[PDB]
C-alpha cells in the first residue's frame, strides 16, 4: 500500500516483546532513555553549520549527508559490554527499510563515507554525545526520531515525541549530494536568499518586479511537504530532485491535481486575487494549506515565484528566468505555425500557436544520472500550464545543455522548451509567405548574483542568432522531434598534451555530397555537471562517392588545461548536415583523459629536525621522447621548493630523483611534485606525510 504521505504516521511499539515472555520478567537490567537533546536552537552549531538557522520552525532541521550532534541521557551509564542500542528515523504510515523510509542508525566506531551511522564522541555521567551522519541520498522530509534498546525479550523503544521530529533537506553544500553546488556565492543566492527580482515587460522596455520567496517563514516548509503529500508522491522517491522538481512542476498549478494556483488571463478575476496584486509566495502557500484548495489567481511570474519558493525551501537551488518573445507550440512540430488570411491579417481560427511578449519559468540545479554525462546542472522546469506532458500540465526537468545542442530526445519535455526559446516563425496563407528565424527568444535573463541587476543568460539556451551552429542545432532538434554514416573518436588522449579528434564519414551511395558541421568541446565535472565550452569549430567538408573520409581536429593543450579539475572529463558534440539532402547527423560522446603518474616515496624517518629522502619517480607515458623535462618538488613544511631537469626521457622510460629534505613543521604535511616538458606539461603527483 503506497507510502505517499509525510503527514501520516504509524505507531511504533514501546515494549516490543517477542515470543511468550514469562510473567515477572525484570527489564530493569536494560537501558532506558531519560532524555534526548538535539541542540536545535538557531544559534547553535547544528542549524548554523547546516545552513538551516533561518527557518522559523523550532524543530531540528538538517541537510542530508552531513553530521549533526545529539545527546542521549540514559538511566545509567551506557556500557557497550552489556548494552546495544540504535537510533531510528521513520517517515510515513508504512515505513520499510528497503524503501529508505525506516532508517536504522547503528552506533559505530568510526563513521563511514556516505553511510548512515552514529558515533559516540563524548561521555559524561549517564549521557552520551552522538555525531550522527545521514546518507547523501536520503529521502527529504520530516522524520520521527526513536531510540531503540535491544534486549533478549525484544526491543524497548522511546515513546512518540513530536519535539524530536527532525527535518532532513537537500544539501547544496555536500559534494556527494545530487544538488551539490560548489560555489558559495551561488549557494547564497540560489538557496538562502528569500528575496528576488523577476524581469518582465518587453525587450527594449525591461521592467522589474520584487518578489518575496519567503521559503524560511513559519509554515512554509510544512506546506511544501503538504504539496508533495497532496500530489500522492511516493516517499521513497522524494530524495531525488528530478522527481521532486517534476512533481512541483505539476502541483504548483491547479490543473489535473488540485494544485496551488489557478491561472487566469481574463482581465476580470472573479472571486479571487488578481494576479498583479501578489507580491510574494507566502500568502498563496499559507492560504493553500489552510483552505486545502487552489488559490485564485496567478499568471506566469506568480507560478514561477511559488515554484521558486517550493524548490529553495527544500534545498534545491533554483532561479527564475524570463524569456522575451516566448513561443507556445501547440502541435509539437517545433515551429510557430501562423496562418494568415489572403487579406493579410492573422487568421485567428486556423492559428493555434502563439508567442508572448515574455514568459517566466524556473531552473533547478541537479545532476542528471538518468542522462549521459554532460547534461546535469541547470534544468528548465515550468509550472505554468501550457501543454500536457504524459497526461498532465507539467514541464521538465529539461536539461538546458541538451536544449542548446538540440538533443531534445533526452527527458523531460526538452522539445517544448526548445520551441519556447528558438522556434522558427512560419507564416502560412497553403503558400508559405515568410520565415522569421530571429524573433523567438530574443533575450533570456535572470537576477544577477548579489544585486538586483539583469544577468543575460541567452547563450546558455541557444547559440547566437545568425551563426551556423544556431541552424545546425535547430535542425538537430527538429530531426529528434543520404546513406552517409558519421562517427568520431578521440585518439590516445593524455592529460597535459595536445590530442586529435577524428571525425569520419562513410558515403555508401554513388553521390558527391557537401557537408557543413560544427564541433563543441566541453569540460565536465565527474558527476556529469557541465563546466564550460573550451573549443568550438564549424567546418565544411566535401564527400566523394563510395568513400571513407577522416577529418582530424587538433585540440591543443592550452585550450583545455586551464579549466580542469579532479576527475573532470571531456564532452564533445558533433553535428553535420548533408547539404544536398538536408539530412542531419548528430553525436555526443564523453572521454576521460589518461593521467600520467608521478610516484612519490620517502625513505628515512619523518621527524622534524632530521634528514629524510624523497624519491620522485616518473614514467614517460608516450610513444615519443620528452625534452627539457623539469621536475619540481613542493613541500610546505618539509622542503623549500626544488627542481631537477632532464634533457631527455626516452619512450616508456623511467627517471628517478632523490632529494634530501629536513622538515621544520611537525604534523600532517604534504609533498607535491610537478613535471613539465616541451610537449607534456603540468602533470602532478602528491603524497601525504606525517612528520613528528
Amino acid at each position: 500500500p503506497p507510502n505517499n504521505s509525510n503527514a501520516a504516521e504509524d505507531d511504533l511499539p514501546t515494549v516490543e516483546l517477542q515470543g511468550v515472555v514469562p510473567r515477572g520478567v525484570n527489564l530493569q537490567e536494560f537501558l532506558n532513555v531519560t532524555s534526548v537533546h538535539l541542540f536545535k536552537e538557531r544559534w547553535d552549531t547544528n542549524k548554523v553549520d547546516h545552513h538551516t538557522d533561518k527557518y522559523e520552525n523550532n524543530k531540528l532541521i538538517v541537510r542530508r549527508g552531513q553530521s549533526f550532534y545529539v545527546q542521549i541521557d540514559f538511566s545509567r551509564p551506557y556500557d557497550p559490554r552489556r548494552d546495544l542500542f540504535r537510533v531510528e528515523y521513520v517517515i510515513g504510515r508504512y515505513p520499510q527499510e528497503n524503501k529508505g523510509t525506516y532508517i536504522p542508525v547503528p552506533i559505530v566506531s568510526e563513521l563511514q563515507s556516505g553511510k548512515w551511522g552514529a558515533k559516540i564522541v563524548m561521555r559524561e555521567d549517564r549521557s552520551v554525545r552522538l555525531s550522527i551522519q545521514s546518507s547523501p541520498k536520503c529521502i527529504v522530509g520530516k522524520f520521527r526520531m526513536y531510540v531503540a534498546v535491544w534486549t533478549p525479550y525484544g526491543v524497548l523503544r522511546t515513546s512518540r515525541n513530536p519535539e524530536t521530529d527532525t527535518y532532513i533537506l537537500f544539501n547544496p553544500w555536500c559534494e556527494d549530494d545530487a544538488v551539490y553546488l560548489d560555489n558559495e556565492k551561488e549557494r547564497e543566492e540560489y538557496v538562502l536568499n528569500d528575496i528576488g527580482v523577476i524581469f518582465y515587460g518587453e525587450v527594449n522596455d525591461i521592467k522589474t518586479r520584487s518578489w518575496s520567496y519567503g521559503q524560511f517563514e513559519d509554515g512554509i516548509l510544512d506546506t511544501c511537504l503538504y504539496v508533495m503529500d497532496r500530489a500522492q508522491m511516493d516517499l521513497s522517491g522524494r530524495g531525488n530532485p528530478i522527481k521532486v522538481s517534476r512533481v512541483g512542476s505539476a502541483m504548483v498549478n491547479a490543473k489535473d491535481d488540485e494544485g496551488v494556483l489557478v491561472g487566469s488571463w481574463d482581465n476580470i478575476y472573479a472571486y479571487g486575487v488578481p494576479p498583479s496584486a501578489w507580491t510574494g509566495s507566502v500568502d498563496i502557500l499559507l492560504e493553500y494549506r489552510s483552505s486545502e484548495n487552489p488559490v485564485r489567481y496567478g499568471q506566469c511570474w506568480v507560478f514561477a515565484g511559488v515554484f521558486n519558493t517550493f524548490l529553495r525551501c527544500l534545498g534545491i537551488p533554483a532561479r527564475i528566468v524570463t524569456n522575451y518573445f516566448s513561443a507556445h507550440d501547440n502541435d509539437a512540430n517545433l515551429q510557430m505555425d501562423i496562418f494568415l488570411e489572403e487579406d493579410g491579417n492573422v487568421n485567428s481560427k486556423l492559428t493555434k500557436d502563439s508567442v508572448w511578449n515574455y514568459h517566466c519559468w524556473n531552473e533547478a540545479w541537479m545532476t542528471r544520472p538518468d542522462l549521459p554525462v554532460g547534461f546535469g546542472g541547470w534544468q528548465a522546469v515550468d509550472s505554468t500550464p501550457q501543454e500536457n506532458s504524459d497526461g498532465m500540465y507539467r514541464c521538465g526537468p529539461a536539461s538546458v545543455q541538451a536544449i542548446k545542442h538540440g538533443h531534445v530526445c533526452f527527458q523531460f519535455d526538452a522539445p517544448f522548451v526548445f520551441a519556447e526559446v528558438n522556434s522558427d516563425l512560419i507564416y502560412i496563407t497553403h503558400v508559405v509567405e515568410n520565415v522569421d528565424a530571429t524573433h523567438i527568444g530574443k533575450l533570456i535573463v535572470t537576477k544577477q548574483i548579489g544585486g538586483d541587476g539583469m544577468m543575460d543568460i541567452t547563450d546558455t539556451y541557444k547559440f547566437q542568432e545568425g551563426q551556423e551552429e544556431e541552424r545546425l542545432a535547430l535542425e538537430t532538434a527538429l530531426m529528434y522531434g543520404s546513406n552517409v554514416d558519421m562517427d568520431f573518436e578521440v585518439e590516445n588522449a593524455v592529460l597535459g598534451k595536445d590530442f586529435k579528434l577524428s571525425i569520419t564519414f562513410r558515403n555508401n551511395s554513388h553521390n558527391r555530397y557537401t557537408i557543413t558541421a560544427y564541433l563543441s568541446a566541453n569540460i565536465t565535472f565527474y558527476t556529469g555537471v557541465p563546466k564550460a565550452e573550451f573549443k568550438k569549430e564549424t567546418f565544411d567538408v566535401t564527400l566523394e562517392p563510395l568513400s571513407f573520409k577522416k577529418e582530424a581536429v587538433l585540440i591543443q593543450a592550452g585550450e583545455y588545461m586551464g579549466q580542469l579539475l579532479e576527475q573532470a572529463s571531456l564532452h564533445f558534440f558533433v553535428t553535420a548536415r548533408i547539404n544536398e539532402t538536408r539530412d542531419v547527423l548528430a553525436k555526443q560522446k564523453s572521454t576521460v583523459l589518461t593521467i600520467p603518474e608521478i610516484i612519490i616515496k620517502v625513505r628515512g624517518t619523518q621527524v622534524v629536525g632530521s634528514d629524510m629522502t624523497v624519491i620522485v619517480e616518473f614514467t614517460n607515458p608516450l610513444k615519443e621522447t620528452l625534452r627539457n623535462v623539469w621536475v619540481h618538488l613542493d613541500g610546505p613544511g618539509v622542503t623549500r621548493p626544488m627542481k631537477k631537469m632532464f634533457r631527455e626521457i626516452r619512450p616508456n622510460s623511467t627517471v628517478q630523483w632523490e632529494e634530501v629534505c629536513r622538515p621544520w613543521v611537525s604534523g600532517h604535511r604534504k609533498l607535491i611534485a610537478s613535471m613539465s616538458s616541451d610537449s607534456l606539461r603540468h602533470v602532478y603527483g602528491e603524497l601525504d606525510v606525517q612528520i613528528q
Binding site: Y200, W265, S276, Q299, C300, W301, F325, M336, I338, V346, T351, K352, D353, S354, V355, W356, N357, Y358, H359, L425
Partner: peptide
C-alpha cells in the same frame, strides 16, 4: 501585462 503579441 503578460499578452499574446502574435497568433
Amino acid at each position: 501585462f503578460x499578452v499574446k503579441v502574435i497568433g
